[PDB]
């Protein structure tokens, strides 16, 4: 119930079926324009669910106008690289990030692996995964990176 499901596919592309079967600064995004999970990428991938303006979780599947995603609250307090990605209503992949790449691109060649990576980024299927372990701001991060 925490996931926004505003998915218009009038162009009949089929991005919704693959969900069930087999830049800009990260601030606040309106749930009504989101389809599917919202992944924010600290040095590791984190899932963001729908909330109101205070941070209280909502369970309306992103239907109401007040449902938002607090991307800024997920920003690392230490100030490291940060970015979030998601799919919007008409099936396009959106990213946010500072001027590391935009969304999940730690490197212009690498990408943080996460369950819906092939759903948001189909062009990175043939990418090679590298197990990464590093400390960012006093916190250990274990994650995999898909590179060329």
């Amino acid at each position, epitope marked *: 119930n925490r996931t926004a*499901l*505003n*998915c*218009n*596919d009038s162009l*009949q592309t*089929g991005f*919704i*079926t693959s969900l*069930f*079967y087999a830049p800009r600064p990260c601030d606040v995004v309106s749930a*009504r324009t989101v389809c599917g999970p919202v992944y924010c990428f600290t040095p590791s991938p984190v899932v963001v669910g729908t909330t109101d303006k205070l941070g209280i979780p909502t369970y*309306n*599947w*992103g*239907e109401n106008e007040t449902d938002v995603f607090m991307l800024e609250s997920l920003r690392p307090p230490t100030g490291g690289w940060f970015g979030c990605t998601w799919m919007n*209503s008409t099936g396009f992949t959106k990213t946010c990030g500072a001027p590391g790449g935009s969304g999940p691109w730690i490197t212009p060649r690498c990408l943080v692996d996460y369950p819906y990576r092939l759903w948001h980024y189909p062009c990175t299927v043939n990418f090679t995964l590298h197990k990464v372990r590093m400390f960012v701001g006093g916190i250990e991060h274990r994650f995999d990176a898909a590179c060329n």
Partner: antibody
Amino acid sequence: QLLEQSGPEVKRPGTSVKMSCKISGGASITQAMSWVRQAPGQGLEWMGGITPIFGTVNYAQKILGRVTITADEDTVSLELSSLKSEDTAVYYCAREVNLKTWNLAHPNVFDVWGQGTMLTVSS
Amino acid sequence: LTLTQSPSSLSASVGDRVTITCRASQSISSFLNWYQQKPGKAPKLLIYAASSLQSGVPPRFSGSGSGTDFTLTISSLQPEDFATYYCQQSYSTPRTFGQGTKLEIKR
């Protein structure tokens, strides 16, 4: 975009029938689907609907005992048991959608209709 | 909730302005839809959300109303508009339809 329905059926009283409805393309079932029946020379009457994401199913109070609505990847079906002469009607599947927000959790309008499957209950 | 349409039968000429009312036994907010059914064919969506025109529907079709009383308006009747018109509420848990309005054309 387009909906295919199974062919017309003639059934003796007391038996059961299963009517099915397909997307008629390479697509899989995503949106909520509903069944609307129309007796000959009569009005439209909602019987039941299924929501694939929730898996939940609703029915009409008059037929709750003998109707079941099932769905898989590409086919929604409607089964009626203990058929009687009053079940003679045309049976439509209709995709229920939210045209304001396209939210899968709150479908509130039938935007695409199958061309109907006519059932006759007769001995 | 219960939907009652007025009138049940309608007769008008090409170019006439016609209206059809739907009356809900209780408030349905704006979850009212209009459908057009030509003989032998499946119903076709005309107006959703009581007032929003569906993509591809000619602009002479229009809807208005809220709460318990609703209206479908055809600004200039055309021969293709010969059909039966149904209102449908999607507010409560069992979806319901109006009895339907048959629209005959005089010439």
